[PDB]
């Protein structure tokens, strides 16, 4: 699971 | 019914109305408790700081 | 003339104190400057209002009052209050770290560090009294300071002023405006410790005054300001005899005499009428017999209970304003019939009456309408015991699991003191029971 | 009980810490340079709680930024409010913690901890009356988790009578694929049961599910997850930041929320749920704020409150609304779902109403529940933990830094006790 | 949705009402000690009225009137009927009585003056002994049972036996009528149209007095102490419809005129008297309560009040109709959802 502001 | 003790004045009056008749601890002693809690509390804080020292 | 020093403790005590001394000033015609045009005894006097006010050469009338709060925010508002010139700095005492709704914290921890400063500031007033008759203590049951530090102070005053009188104005806790879960703890705790040091105590359930404010003043969400101005009207009725010239309840000793046969059972139920909305331009002028009858309707009581299923030991009627004895004694004759008033078999089944010709003053711009006549009944009925029962059940529920107890133990208090205070209360409910029910 | 000292440790800690300051700064009308430009005066009444004052009456956050690598803090310093923070209150190393609790708590972090406590001490002396500290951090990494708990243990030693508060981000495989996070989290929990008075359990499993299911974001970002945290943090501290009557300081909150010293892990909820893209043109009704704030969908902890019982509840409503109607709906939930509230704590639900609403909303409701259902969270971590520990997997990363298997067993054991303790009172 | 609790499970009546409440799908039942309830089916005794009406935002109702014990307990009722002006000592419908505390406010014994007032008497006189427990003796000579009272520790009361009761034929049988009365929170006095005759099984003879069971008409005595049951009426429970028909074909009258008017009168008199003492019109909580009045009729068709049952049981036949009726009038009037009574 890829999650950057 | 009986009215009694009619006390009057310029600022008010009062009376009684009957319908039927009948049918310490010391100063130091206080402080002994205030310090008995300061110690109990200082102890529980010593045990924490003791636990934290570990 | 015998002086009375008023002691306001905690948030509740100080805020109610303001409602009172504000009302006092309106009734005695004292300005926000402390100046009194009506008064001519400049510098000093033997008047009856001098029992609550001292006098200065400049002509200022200064409340014989001390304010205390472990938190500075509340008392700070007095300092910049609309009535700020009245009080001088030495009267307003403030800490910085409050008691966080913890009795133990207010009694033991924070309490020890300020008890000797407050007694010092009280002593400075006692040394301005020619014949001090006693103290009037204002506080809450639920607060940390109100419950904790109060019980500490009462213990000291029974030593420093052993033969002087001490009367209590106490706010009983109601969930509808309470701000803590542990208020039932702080309540039982402070009562047990204070019981032997209080001669007469007037309980006020926030619940009652809240509903009264809802019902009779048409207020949706009553603020404390709403709750307080109502309380002051009550308190005024109790103290008017000390501040004005009268023959009933003329000094603090008479309160214990008239209302308190059993020293432990010293919690008279207060009932007051008429409470009228000010928004109502026209309000029906309730007659003497009408407001006298209202004294027995629970909806007007300072504590919601049922006097019908209790017995009386005393009963006072304090009328203020346009009232004459003929209308009074008439209404008394009536009520004995319609209403269930049983006295104890060792008391005369009667009423002590008093009238104060000056009528109930109201704060300009308030929620209470000025009325021509009003009454405040002080009945020492056993029905008030219902309030102790309520409070004690909530106590036992939480304590069975020792919930929140660690907060108290952590302040150096002992878990045994909880048991000590609860078993003391269990005796009070028994005493109330032995006096007012058929075996 | 006046000033609070804020600390943020690690990547997660500094990101949510920064976002938290971004939000409340806007609410208190403080601009990035630190000058005040707001309408209402309610904004400046209790400003001293989180901010210090300086020359030119500039407002500086009472915040200490901690990390073992310069990455996130360089980004924060070049962030939006970057220049607001006290430059000296940036305390960072270079080695990094490598998502290792041991590195953060015993070796790499021990090498830096003293320097941080110097900044803590300097801020604590500026205080007229210190309440305590709030820490923001994740439990899944190394710095925030390991070094964070170390700082707590050390701070409790210098300030044992102060209150220790934490916003702790719990790990979830739905958000991170790092295998050792359950080790880090279990070790941290042990520390938190012992050395904090209040801990807000911010669960990344919840934040993700909220973002994906409710807010319909197919690829949730950290910014999306943090928008929720930021909203929660604002609401939870509202009673602290503006004039109020209930839970107005950390100790009073703790006394109301914590019936037992170890059970201080709160379940935060919020409504209306919002995304940075969501419009929110239609303000919610008071009944709607209430039904949602108690709804599991709005819980930030990913626990089903119907599986446990509420020991205590704090509810905070924001915005101009009928305070009358608030009481009725609050009393309605209690009386409707009375079975889910423990009977042996009468009136365990307390409510406050602040007039100033959060940024972008007219009506908002925040939830703080000490539910026994929080155990489901600790149960989740415990299983992920044992799955590896029964085979002693990945332990060499930790033993290499000086730790021993026994220290794991004790942390595992203590958190199993916590779960059982939460269960003891659920059947009461 | 509504919430209620139960604290008396040994009650036959409210076990049924509790059953019917749950059948509406609008009444959830709580644990017996949950404070956040709307209704309370409280306990017969020790009911804590002091805790009701103090829960914010909860309208609270209960199935008992505080202070109602003054009318239901034996010694209290008597003291009430003579001390209360609304019911003169010279009460037409209540038999002569005097309160009796053992040797251990003793009215003991201005009562004896009444006996020697019947030493001049040719009007026979016999006085009973009944009191608290279910476990009662009857004879002319007073001193006999005065020992029986001084024996046990309970408090008692003595009252003239009705020597000429109405006798049902065939059988020459004694009986008494049980009427059920419901009072709501508005103090509307409702009478259940259906009543029952607790008839005696055997003929009534004034010969023998000791455990003679033809004197007493209790369900417990008639079933246990007699080989006589169901001969004339099943259950010894003759309902009003039959008693009505009998009185016409026998004495040429109706239940309505001969008996019911007098019944309906005593009900009003008793409850209106205690009304200001127990009413919840202005209280922080509200009350309602089911009562069971026991009446005796004599050969002159004059009705007498025996006692008032505070915790009455119902006839098996009338449960479904009455317990349903209680919900309509007492509970649903206060707690609305989404006649078999007679107002007085
Ligand atoms: N009637 C009335 N009740 C009040 C008022 N202020 C507080 N209370 C009640 O008092 C209880 C809390 O006690 P407080 O007086 O606020 O606390 P405290 O004495 O300042 O002690 P601390 O714990 O240190 O704050 C609650 O049950 C409130 O409902 C007030 O101004 N008027
Ligand atoms: N003055 C009187 N005249 C005739 N019968 C009388 C009487 N006083 C009492 N009794 C008798 O008392 C008998 C039983 O009545 P009781 O007072 O026991 O009521 P009850 O059993 O239905 C309720 P409980 O006994 O539990 O209090 C009646 O059948 C009646 O015959
Ligand atoms: N919500 C949120 N979680 C984060 C963020 N950064 C890291 N995390 C979580 O924190 C854990 C990793 O800890 P991290 O803070 O990166 O390591 P640290 O620098 O050693 O403290 C993982 O479970 C991540 O999901 C962030 O910005 N927001
Ligand atoms: Ca003067
Ligand atoms: Mg306070
Ligand atoms: Mg990283
Ligand atoms: Mg190194």
DSSP string, C330-341: HHHHHHHHHS--
Domain extent, residue C31, equals: 1-268
* Alpha-carbon gap, residue E284 to C305, rounded angstroms: 8
CA distances from D321 to B15, D47, D233, D284 (A): 53, 24, 22, 11
Distance (Å) from CA C318 to ligand 4 centroid: 26
Q: Which residues contact D114 (CB under 8 A, 6 or more apart)?
A: none
Nearest residue on chain C to D1, alpha-carbon basis: C97
Protein fold of E2-62: Rossmann fold (3.40.50)
The distance from CA D321 to its chain's CA centroid, rounded to whole angstroms, is 27
* Alpha-carbon gap, residue E242 to C101, rounded angstroms: 70
Closest residue by Cα to residue D181 from D109, D104, D73, D68: D104
Ligand 3 site, residue D142, Cβ cutoff 6 A: yes
Contact E344, E291 (CB under 8 A): no
* Alpha-carbon gap, residue C153 to E95, rounded angstroms: 63
Sign of CA dihedral D91, D96, D101, D107: negative
Q: After which residues is chain C discontinuous, taking C to N > 2.5 Å?
A: none
Q: Which helix (H) or strand (E) element contains residue C78? A: helix C73-79
Tokens 């009928």, residue located? D322
Buried b / exposed e over E104-137, threshold 16 CB at 10 Å, is: eeebbeebeebbeeeeeeeeebbbbbbbeeeebe
Angle at E340 between CA E339 and CA E344, to 5 degrees: 90
State phi, psi for E207 to the nearest 5 degrees. -80, -60
Within a 13 Å sphere around the CA of E46, how many CA atoms are in the beta-carbon half? 2
Strands E289-297 and E173-183: antiparallel
Tokens 């008093």, residue located? C354
Resolution in angstroms comes to 2.3
**Is E48 close to C389, i.e. CB distance below 8 A?**
yes
Residues with CB under 5 Å of ion ligand 4 are C 39, 41, 45, 55
Q: Which of C338, C354, C383 is the last residue of a domain?
A: C383
Q: What's the DSSP call for residue E50?
A: G
CA distances from B2 to B6, B20, C329 (A): 11, 9, 10
Distance (Å) from CA D69 to ligand 1 centroid: 48
Task: Summarize chain C as % helix, strand, coil (round to 5).
Answer: 45, 20, 35
Report the number of distinct structural domains present in chain C.
Answer: 3
Question: Which residue puts its alpha carbon closest to atom 7 of ligand 2?
Answer: E161
**Is B12 close to C411, i.e. CB distance below 8 A?**
no
H-assigned helices in C161-196: 183-194
Nearest residue on chain C to E51, alpha-carbon basis: C390
Q: Which residues contact D364 (CB under 8 A, 6 or more apart)?
A: D231, D235, D270, D271, D272, D289, D317, D318, D319, D357, D358
* Alpha-carbon gap, residue D222 to E75, rounded angstroms: 79
Buried b / exposed e over C181-212, threshold 16 CB at 10 Å, is: bbbbbbbbbbbbbbbebbbbbbbbbbbbbbbb
Distance (Å) from CA C104 to ligand 6 centroid: 47
Token readout for D30 is: 């403080």
A 10 A CB-CB count for D114 gives 9
**Is D339 close to E3, i.e. CB distance below 8 A?**
no
Residues C369 and C334 in one domain: yes
Residues C192 and C230 in one domain: yes
**Is D328 close to E57, i.e. CB distance below 8 A?**
yes
A 10 A CB-CB count for C219 gives 18
The distance from CA E292 to its chain's CA centroid, rounded to whole angstroms, is 3
Give SS3 for B4. Answer: strand
Token readout for C399 is: 């304590």
Closest residue by Cα to residue C347 from C235, C217, C435: C435
Q: Which residues of E touch C390 (CB under 8 A)?
A: 50-51, 54
Q: Tell me the sheet residues that pair with C275.
A: none
Distance (Å) from CA C69 to ligand 5 centroid: 7
Q: How many residues are there in chain D?
A: 428
Closest residue by Cα to residue C44 from C59, C24, C25: C59
Q: Which DSSP string corresponds to C313-373?
A: EEEEEEEEES--HHHHHHHHHHHHHHS--EEPTTS-SEEEEEEESS-----TTSSB---SE
A 10 A CB-CB count for B20 gives 13
* Alpha-carbon gap, residue E144 to E142, rounded angstroms: 5
A 10 A CB-CB count for B43 gives 11
Residues C175 and C297 in one domain: no
Q: Which residues of C touch B44 (CB under 8 A)?
A: 409-410, 412
Mutate to test the interface with E, among C184, C296, C308 (most CBs of E within 10 A): C308
Q: Tell me the sheet residues that pair with E165.
A: E298
* Alpha-carbon gap, residue E284 to E53, rounded angstroms: 5
Closest residue by Cα to residue D368 from D237, D196, D214: D237
Mutate to test the interface with D, among C15, C73, C401 (most CBs of D within 10 A): C401
Least CB–CB distance from B12: residue in C333, C357, C414: C357
Strands (E), C159-236: 165-172, 200-205
Q: Which residues of D touch C100 (CB under 8 A)?
A: 1, 249, 251-252, 254-255
Contact D145, D137 (CB under 8 A): yes
**Is B18 close to C111, i.e. CB distance below 8 A?**
no
| Domains of chain E, residue spans | 2-62, 68-71+166-343
Strands (E), E172-302: 173-183, 189-192, 196-203, 237-239, 286-287, 289-297
Contact D190, D411 (CB under 8 A): yes
Q: Which DSSP string corresponds to C301-317?
A: BSS---GGGSEEEEEEE
Closest residue by Cα to residue D258 from D300, D305, D313, D201: D313
Give SS3 for C168. Answer: strand
Closest residue by Cα to residue E75 from E91, E92, E102, E98: E98
Strands E341-343 and E189-192: antiparallel
Q: Tell me the sheet residues that pair with C93.
A: C68
Residues C242 and C291 in one domain: no
Q: Which residues contact D146 (CB under 8 A, 6 or more apart)?
A: D97, D100, D101, D102, D103, D104, D105, D106, D109, D184, D187, D188
A 10 A CB-CB count for C346 gives 10
Question: Using only C-alpha atoms, what is the Rg of chain E?
Answer: 21
CA distance C158 to chain D (A): 31
Ligand 2 site, residue E290, Cβ cutoff 6 A: no
* Alpha-carbon gap, residue C277 to C370, rounded angstroms: 9
Tell me if the bond preceding D248 is cis, omega within 30° of 0: no
State phi, psi for C213 to the nearest 5 degrees. -65, -35
Would an 8 Å CB–CB cutoff place C356 in contact with chain B? yes
Task: Give Dmax (Cα) for chain B.
Answer: 81
Contact C182, C404 (CB under 8 A): yes
**Is B49 close to D157, i.e. CB distance below 8 A?**
yes
Q: At what angle do helices C415-435 and C385-399 cross, to 10 degrees?
A: 150
Closest residue by Cα to residue C139 from C227, C209, C223, C69: C69
Question: Using only C-alpha atoms, what is the Rg of chain D?
Answer: 20
H-assigned helices in E84-122: 111-116
Question: Which residue puts its alpha carbon closest to atom 3 of ligand 3?
Answer: D12
Tokens 């213990």, residue located? C155
Q: What's the DSSP call for residue C404?
A: T
Q: Which of C345, C362, C383 is the last residue of a domain?
A: C383
Residues C305 and C400 in one domain: no
* Alpha-carbon gap, residue D208 to D173, rounded angstroms: 10
* Alpha-carbon gap, residue D272 to D290, rounded angstroms: 10
Tell me the three-class secondary structure of chain D, residue by residue.
CCEEEEEEEHHHHHHHHHHHHHHHHHHCCECCCCCECCCCCHHHCCHHHCEEECHHHCEEECEEEEECCCHHHHHHHCCCCHHHCCHHHEEECCCCCCCCHHHHHCCCCHHHHHHHHHHHHHHHHCCCCEEEEEEEEECCCCHHHHHHHHHHHHHHHHCCCCEEEEEEEECCCCCCCCCCHHHHHHHHHHHHHHHCCEEEEEEHHHHHHHHHHHCCCCCCCHHHHHHHHHHHHHHHCHHHHCCCCCCCCHHHHHHHHCCCCCCCEEEEEEECCCCCCCCCCCCCCHHHHHHHHCCHHHECCCCCHHHCCEEEEEEEEECCCCHHHHHHHHHHHHHHCHHHECCCCCCCEEEEEECCCCCCCCCEEEEEEEEHHHHHHHHHHHHHHHHHHCCCCCCHHHHCCCCCHHHHHHHHHHHHHHHHHHHHCCCC
Token readout for E170 is: 């065939």
Give SS3 for C104. Answer: helix
State phi, psi for E194 to the nearest 5 degrees. -85, 130
Distance (Å) from CA D148 to ligand 3 centroid: 13
Ligand 2 site, residue E302, Cβ cutoff 6 A: no
Nearest residue on chain A to D226, alpha-carbon basis: A5
Q: How many residues are there in chain B?
A: 54
**Is A1 close to D79, i.e. CB distance below 8 A?**
no
Token readout for D260 is: 């037992």
Q: Tell me the sheet residues that pair with D51.
A: D61
Chains that touch C (3 or more CB pairs under 8 A): B, D, E
* Alpha-carbon gap, residue C298 to C377, rounded angstroms: 12
> What was the elucidation method?
X-ray
| Domains of chain D, residue spans | 1-259, 260-373, 374-428
Q: Which residues of B touch D157 (CB under 8 A)?
A: 49, 52
Token readout for C418 is: 């909880």
Contact D362, D319 (CB under 8 A): yes
Ligand 3 site, residue D141, Cβ cutoff 6 A: yes
Class of domain E68-71+166-343: alpha beta
Q: Tell me the sheet residues that pair with B14.
A: B7, C354
Contact D137, D9 (CB under 8 A): yes
* Alpha-carbon gap, residue C221 to D324, rounded angstroms: 5
CA distances from D207 to D171, D199, D221, D302, D374 (A): 11, 17, 10, 8, 15
Ligand 3 site, residue D226, Cβ cutoff 6 A: yes
Task: Give Dmax (Cα) for chain C.
Answer: 64
Would an 8 Å CB–CB cutoff place B15 in contact with chain C? yes
Q: How many beta-carbon pairs below 8 A join chains C and E?
A: 34
């Amino acid at each position: 699971x890829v999650x950057x502001x | 019914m009986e009215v009694i003790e009619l006390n009057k004045c310029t600022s008010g009056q009062s009376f009684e109305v009957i319908l039927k008749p009948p049918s310490d601890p010391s100063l130091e002693e206080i402080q002994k408790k205030l310090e008995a809690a300061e110690e109990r509390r200082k102890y529980q804080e010593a045990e924490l700081l003791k636990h934290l020292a570990e | 003339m015998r002086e009375c020093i008023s002691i306001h403790v905690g948030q509740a005590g100080v805020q109610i104190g303001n409602a009172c001394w504000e009302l006092y000033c309106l009734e005695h015609g004292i300005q926000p400057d402390g100046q009194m045009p009506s008064d001519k005894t400049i510098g000093g006097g033997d008047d009856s209002f001098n029992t609550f006010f001292s006098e200065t050469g400049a002509g200022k009338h200064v409340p014989r009052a001390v304010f205390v709060d472990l938190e500075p925010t509340v008392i700070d508002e007095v300092r910049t209050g609309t009535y700020r010139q009245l009080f001088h700095p030495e009267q307003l005492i403030t800490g910085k770290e409050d008691a966080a709704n913890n009795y133990a914290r207010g009694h033991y921890t924070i309490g020890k560090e300020i008890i000797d400063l407050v007694l010092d500031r009280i002593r400075k007033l006692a040394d301005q009294c020619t014949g001090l008759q006693g103290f009037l203590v204002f506080h809450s049951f639920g607060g940390g300071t109100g419950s904790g530090f109060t019980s500490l102070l009462m213990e000291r005053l029974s030593v420093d002023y052993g033969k002087k009188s001490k009367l209590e104005f106490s706010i009983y806790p109601a969930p509808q405006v309470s701000t803590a879960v542990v208020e039932p703890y702080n309540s039982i705790l402070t009562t047990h410790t204070t019981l032997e040091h209080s001669d007469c105590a007037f309980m006020v359930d926030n619940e009652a005054i809240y509903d009264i404010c809802r019902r009779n003043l048409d207020i949706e969400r009553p603020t404390y300001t709403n709750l307080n101005r109502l309380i002051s009207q009550i308190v005024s009725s109790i103290t008017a005899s000390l501040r004005f010239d009268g023959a009933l309840n003329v000094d603090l000793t008479e309160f214990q005499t008239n209302l308190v046969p059993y020293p432990r059972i010293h919690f008279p139920l207060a009932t007051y009428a008429p409470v009228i909305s000010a928004e109502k331009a026209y309000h029906e002028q309730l007659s003497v017999a009408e407001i006298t009858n209202a004294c027995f309707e629970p909806a007007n009581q300072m504590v919601k209970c049922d006097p019908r299923h209790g017995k009386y030991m005393a009963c006072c009627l304090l009328y203020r304003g346009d009232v004459v004895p003929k209308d009074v004694n008439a209404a008394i004759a009536t009520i004995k019939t319609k209403r269930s008033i049983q006295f104890v078999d060792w008391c005369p089944t009667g009423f002590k009456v008093g009238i104060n010709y000056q009528p109930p003053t109201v704060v300009p711009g308030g929620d209470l309408a000025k009325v021509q006549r009003a009454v405040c009944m002080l009945s020492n009925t056993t029905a008030i015991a219902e309030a102790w029962a309520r409070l004690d059940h909530k106590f036992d529920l939480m304590y069975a699991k020792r919930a929140f107890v660690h907060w108290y133990v952590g302040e150096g208090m002992e878990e045994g003191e909880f048991s000590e205070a609860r078993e003391d209360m269990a005796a009070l409910e028994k005493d109330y029971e032995e006096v007012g029910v058929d075996s | 009980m006046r000033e609070i000292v804020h600390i943020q440790a690690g990547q997660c800690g500094n990101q949510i810490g920064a976002k938290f300051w971004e939000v409340i700064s806007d609410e208190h009308g403080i601009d990035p340079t630190g000058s005040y430009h707001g309408d209402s005066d309610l904004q400046l009444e209790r400003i001293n709680v989180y901010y210090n004052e300086a020359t030119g009456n500039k407002y500086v956050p009472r915040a200490i930024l901690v990390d073992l690598e310069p990455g996130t803090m360089d980004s924060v310093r070049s962030g939006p409010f970057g220049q607001i923070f006290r430059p000296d209150n940036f305390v960072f190393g270079q080695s990094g913690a490598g998502n290792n609790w041991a590195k953060g708590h015993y070796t790499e972090g021990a090498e830096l901890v003293d320097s941080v406590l110097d900044v803590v001490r300097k801020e604590s002396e500026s205080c007229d009356c210190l309440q305590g500290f709030q820490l923001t951090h994740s439990l899944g990494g190394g710095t925030g988790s390991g070094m964070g708990t170390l700082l707590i243990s050390k701070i409790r030693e210098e300030y044992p009578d102060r209150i220790m508060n934490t916003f702790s981000v719990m790990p979830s495989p739905k958000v991170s694929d790092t295998v050792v996070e359950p080790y880090n989290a279990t070790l941290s929990v042990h520390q938190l049961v012992e050395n904090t008075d209040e801990t807000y359990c911010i669960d990344n499993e919840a934040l993700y599910d909220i973002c994906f299911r409710t807010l319909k974001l197919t690829t949730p970002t950290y910014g999306d997850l943090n928008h929720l945290v930021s909203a929660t943090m604002s609401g939870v501290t509202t009673c602290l930041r503006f004039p109020g009557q209930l839970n107005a300081d950390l100790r009073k909150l703790a006394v109301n929320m914590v019936p037992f010293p170890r059970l201080h892990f709160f379940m935060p909820g919020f409504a209306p749920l919002t995304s940075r893209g969501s419009q929110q043109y239609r303000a919610l009704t008071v009944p709607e704020l209430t039904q949602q704030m108690f709804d599991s969908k709005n819980m930030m902890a990913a626990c089903d409150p119907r599986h446990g019982r509420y020991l205590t509840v704090a509810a905070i409503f924001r915005g101009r609304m009928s305070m009358k109607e608030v009481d009725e709906q609050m009393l309605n939930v209690q009386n409707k779902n009375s079975s889910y509230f423990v009977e042996w704590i009468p009136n365990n639900v307390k409510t406050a109403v602040c007039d100033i609403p959060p940024r972008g909303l007219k009506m908002s409701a925040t939830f703080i529940g000490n539910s026994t259902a929080i155990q489901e969270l600790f149960k989740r971590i415990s299983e992920q933990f044992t799955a590896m520990f029964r085979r002693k997997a990945f332990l060499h990363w930790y033993t290499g830094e000086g730790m021993d298997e026994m220290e794991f067993t004790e942390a595992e054991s203590n958190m199993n006790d916590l779960v059982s303790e939460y269960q003891q009172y659920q059947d009461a | 949705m509504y919430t209620f609790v139960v604290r008396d499970e040994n009650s036959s009546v409210y076990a049924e009402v509790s059953r019917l409440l749950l059948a509406t799908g609008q009444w959830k039942r709580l644990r017996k000690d949950n404070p956040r309830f709307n209704l309370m089916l409280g306990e017969r005794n020790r009911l804590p009225f002091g805790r009701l009406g103090h829960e914010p935002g909860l309208v609270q109702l209960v199935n008992y009137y505080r202070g109602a014990d003054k009318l239901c307990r034996k010694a209290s009722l008597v003291k009430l009927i003579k001390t209360s002006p609304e019911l003169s000592e010279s009460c037409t419908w209540f038999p002569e009585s005097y309160v009796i505390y053992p040797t251990n406010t003793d009215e003991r014994e201005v009562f004896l003056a009444a006996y020697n007032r019947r030493r001049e008497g040719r009007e026979g006189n016999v006085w009973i002994a009944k009191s608290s427990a279910g476990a009662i003796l009857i004879s002319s000579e007073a001193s006999e049972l005065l020992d029986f009272i001084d024996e046990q520790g309970q408090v008692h009361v003595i009252q003239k036996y009705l020597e000429k009761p109405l006798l049902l034929e065939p059988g020459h049988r004694k009986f008494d009528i049980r009427s059920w009365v419901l009072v709501d929170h508005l103090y509307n006095i409702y009478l259940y149209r259906e009543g029952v005759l607790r008839t005696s099984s055997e003929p009534y003879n004034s010969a023998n007095f000791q455990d003679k069971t033809c004197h007493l008409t209790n369900h417990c005595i008639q079933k246990e102490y007699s080989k006589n049951y169901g001969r004339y009426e099943e259950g010894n429970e003759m309902f009003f419809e039959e008693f009505n028909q009998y009185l016409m074909d026998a004495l040429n009258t109706t239940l309505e005129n001969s008996i019911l008017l007098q019944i309906k009168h005593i009900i009003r008199s008793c409850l209106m008297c205690i009304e200001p003492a127990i009413s919840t019109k202005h209280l922080h909580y509200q009350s309602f309560q089911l009562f069971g009045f026991d009446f005796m009729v004599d050969e002159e068709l004059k009705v007498w009040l025996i006692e008032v049952n505070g915790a009455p049981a119902c006839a098996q036949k009338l449960y479904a109709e009455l317990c349903q009726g209680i919900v309509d009038v007492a509970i649903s009037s206060v707690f609305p959802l989404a006649s078999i009574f007679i107002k007085l």
